[PDB]
Each structure stands twice: as C-alpha cells, then as structure tokens.
Design a binder for this molecule. Structure first.
Ligand SMILES: CC(C)c1cc2ncccc2[nH]1
Ligand SMILES: CC(C)c1cc2ncccc2[nH]1
Lengths: 264, 265
C-alpha cells in the first residue's frame, strides 16, 4: 500500500483469502469491514500516527466509532484482488470521518463504498468531548481541505436516523460472547465483531437467498470481554431489517442498525 | 505465492495485519493457523485441485484433519513479512500429511514449523476409510517421493499419544457457540475455530505472562453450526503444560483433545 501522489489519501490491494469467503465463494461483509480497518491503520501509520496524535497522547484522548455505513455492489470472489482507497476529513469540533472506495483491480470498476463517523473520548473516564484546536491542526496536515465524500448524494442512507427496536423482536440470537480472537491488540472487542453479532439474528434463509447491499450501524457502548450480548432483528419491509444489540442481563443498548438485502 | 523450482512445494509471503495480532503486537496462534490453511489452499489450486482430486469427486470422498501440531519460536510482529513453505506427502493407505515451515522474510531464519495428518472420509456417510491406489497415484504427481519432514527428530512431540482429561477439570469455558464468521465456504466450522475454543479455557494470567510454544490438537468429531461446546483444561506441569478437552455441552461427546506448552516471557 501507499499514499497517493498528493499525500491526501491511501491505497492498498488485497487478495481475497480462502477462509474470508462465505457460501457464494465471495468475501463476507465482516471480511470487507476488516480490510477497511486494515487500510485505515496503514494510512494512519504512513502519516505519522502512534491510532492517536501527539496531542491526544498528551491528553489521554482516543477516537471511538459512532457509526459505520457500508454499501456493496459486488463482493470480491476468493482469489480476486480488491483495491481500497481511504481518506479522512475533520468535521469541525463534532469529530472526524474516514471514507473508503472499493474497486475491482482488474476492471477498475467501483464495487463498494463506506463511511464512518468517529468521536473523541477521554480513555480513562470514557467521557465524550469536542475536538480541540490542536487536534484539528494535526488533521489538516493529511486531510483534503475541500469536501471529498464517499456518499455525496443529498439525503443519502448514511445519514438516516435509526429508531429503537420495540419488544418483542421478530428474530433473536441470545447469549453471544466474545472470545480472544474477537479482541484487538488493546484487549477491546474489535468493531467488526459487533457487525457479526448484528447479522447473527438474520434468518439463514435470508442469507441463502439474498445478498447484503447496505448496513448502517450506530455504536453507543462497548461490550466488555466478560459481557454477554443479545442480538434482536425485526423485518421493516428487497428486504429491510431493524437491529438492536443489548447486554443480556440488564438490557443496556450497545448498538442499533439497519440492513437492506437484494434477492439473488 | 508460487510453486518452487522443482514443483514439489509452494511458498507464499504474508504481511501481518493490525487485527491479526494480540496484546504483544505479534500474530496470534489462530492467525498463524489461518495463514497455514491459506498457503495450503493456494498450493492445492496451483497443482490442479477442485480440495479434492478427480477420483475423490467421482467417489464422494473428502479429507478431514485428524491432528494439527504447531511449534512457534517467534511470532511475527504487526507489519512484518512472514514466508511460509508447504508440501504434502502420502503416508501409504493411512492418509496424507501436510507440513509447513515459517521464516522471517528479512532474516531468513526459521520462526516456526507445523505438521498435520489427514484421513479420507465419505462425504455423505461420514465414514472413514483407507486411501485407494488411484488417489495415491494422483498425490505422487506433486509430492516429494523421498521423506521430507518438518519434524524429523526421533521422539518429537508431534507424534505423542494424548490422554483424555478426567473430570473435574481445573479450568473451563462453557457454552461456546460458532457464529457465521467461524464457518468455511461449505458451512462447516473452520478447523482454526477449534484451536480458539481450546485456548479459551487457559487462564488470562497465563496468556499475559507466557508465550504459547507448542500446540497439539486431535480432531475426533465435527461441531455442527447449531451445537454448543465446553472447553476444559487441567495443568499437567519456567514452562507450563496443559491437557485440553472440547466436548459437546449437552451429552458430553468428545470433539477434540490436545496439549499446549507455554514458556515464561
Ligand atoms: C464500541 C465502541 C466503538 C464505542 C463505544 C462508545 N461509547 C460512546 C460513543 C460511541 C462509542 N463507540
Ligand atoms: C476436522 C473435523 C471436521 C473432523 C471430523 C472428524 N471425524 C473423524 C475423524 C477426524 C475428524 N475431523
């Protein structure tokens, strides 16, 4: 992988692996989300990151995902090469955004796009906060200053408000727990694990007859290594679903989201 | 990746990813086991597989892992490039073996080795069987005919008999269930998931103070997509050794047994 000529975005190519594909012999949406994280990390490394800046390290600040939105037109097959371009943008004092474009390396055609919103948090107190002037200055060095959006379209799916699923849910998968492979290097549950848990409550007959086209997930609270999660889904419709992940015991919400599926 | 000059082994290089590493910023043993599977698959594709031979597809036969043995001297760090060489050998009518050697791409030093035993099974009845003459002929085309062992040594750990853990276990992790990411393209639980489940019952204090040096795992029965597993571990021992057992949560049917050896950091 490498920064592009202007140094304001990063590109990397990936060959889809045997264990990364599902029943159609194409990459799962969790494989796509892991590749998005990987290219994001390689971009941060290339522009001088620790994924914190110097000021964030001095103030004990970290970024946490507030929302992830992914749209896939074609999933890459086992052995195919996918090229992913990523870039970041400051959104004033609210937070930052990381966007991605996925292309088939042979045809050059756009096969998917994604966008994520990140908010600042004090890592000790876990309290959210606005982005300071020093942090915005550090981002200006490696972000495009004119807007560059993976989802430009007015009133597009990536910015829609998601409601809270009402009990009783139509479908559920109860008692989900993370194992060590679900943790990142800092022993926190990897963001992609929550996507897997959301999808666990979709009936297998939908997965067998449809392809996932769009997923929008809001992240509200972290699942700890010793927590247990319930995944709830209700059809709202193409087939569309409303999702909710909550802690098994007290019912505390950890995520809410929506998925749109196209019949094969 | 590519077959070597003689066409009897295959090599591939991998850059260790951010999500593939644990607390020490080095690849987990599950990441190593997934890379071993990936290079094995690329080798099979390179020599004409479709992972069965022509005769196997005609008779509805498949290979299943009976044992996996991995020894790691140094885990590769995040961003490091690891080169893995793999090859297969026929073991008469018993089954086949796939071996691997892991090297640091910059130093050329061997950082790990692995060996796996595979047995033939009828895909429909799930009944094990001996390897036929036609299948052995197909393997002779792409295997070295003289022995080539990742674990040559006389009384090496890879061939040791593993006993069955006696209740009560010292440690346990109960109610483990596979999710869709744990399944392969044929909707079977990926072999590497069983390694993760074995390790779940090791106390976190051991993982925080030691590095896993050797793991030997016997596979006896498949965990179905709707099954639930219990992972049991008992210490048997600067080195710590454990005995492991995975069994179905309900009836207690054994699915795997194994041993791990850990060295203090
Ligand atoms: C699970 C992670 C991504 C996460 C925790 C959290 N807390 C507050 C707001 C957003 C948040 N996101
Ligand atoms: C690896 C799993 C699917 C497996 C099932 C099995 N059955 C008999 C002997 C070995 C076996 N291994």
């Amino acid at each position: 992988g490498s920064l592009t000529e202007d140094g304001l975005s990063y590109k990397e190519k990936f060959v889809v692996r045997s264990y990364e594909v599902g029943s159609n012999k194409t990459a799962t949406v969790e494989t796509i989300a892991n590749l998005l994280q990987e290219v994001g990390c390689n971009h941060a490394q290339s522009v001088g990151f620790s994924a914190t800046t110097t000021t964030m390290r001095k103030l004990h600040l970290i970024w946490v995902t507030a929302r992830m939105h992914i749209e896939i037109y074609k999933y890459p097959a086992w052995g195919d090469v996918v090229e992913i371009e990523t870039w970041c943008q400051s959104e004033g004092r609210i937070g930052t955004r990381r966007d991605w474009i996925l292309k088939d390396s042979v045809t050059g055609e756009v096969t998917g796009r994604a966008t994520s919103k990140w908010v600042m948090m004090n890592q000790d107190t876990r309290r959210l906060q606005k982005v300071s002037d020093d942090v915005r200055d550090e981002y200006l060095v490696f972000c495009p200053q004119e807007p560059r959006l993976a989802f430009p379209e007015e009133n597009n799916r990536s910015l829609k408000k998601i409601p809270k699923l009402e009990d009783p849910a139509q479908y559920s998968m109860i008692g989900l727990k993370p194992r060590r492979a679900d943790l990142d290097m800092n022993q926190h549950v990897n963001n992609v694990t929550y996507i897997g848990w959301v999808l666990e409550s979709i009936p297998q007959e939908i997965v067998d007859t449809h392809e996932l086209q769009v997923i929008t997930l809001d992240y509200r609270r972290e699942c700890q290594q010793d927590d247990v999660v319930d995944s709830l889904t209700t059809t709202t419709s193409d087939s569309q679903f409303l999702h909710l992940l909550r802690l098994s015991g007290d019912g505390q919400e950890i995520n809410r989201g929506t998925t749109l599926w196209r019949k094969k």
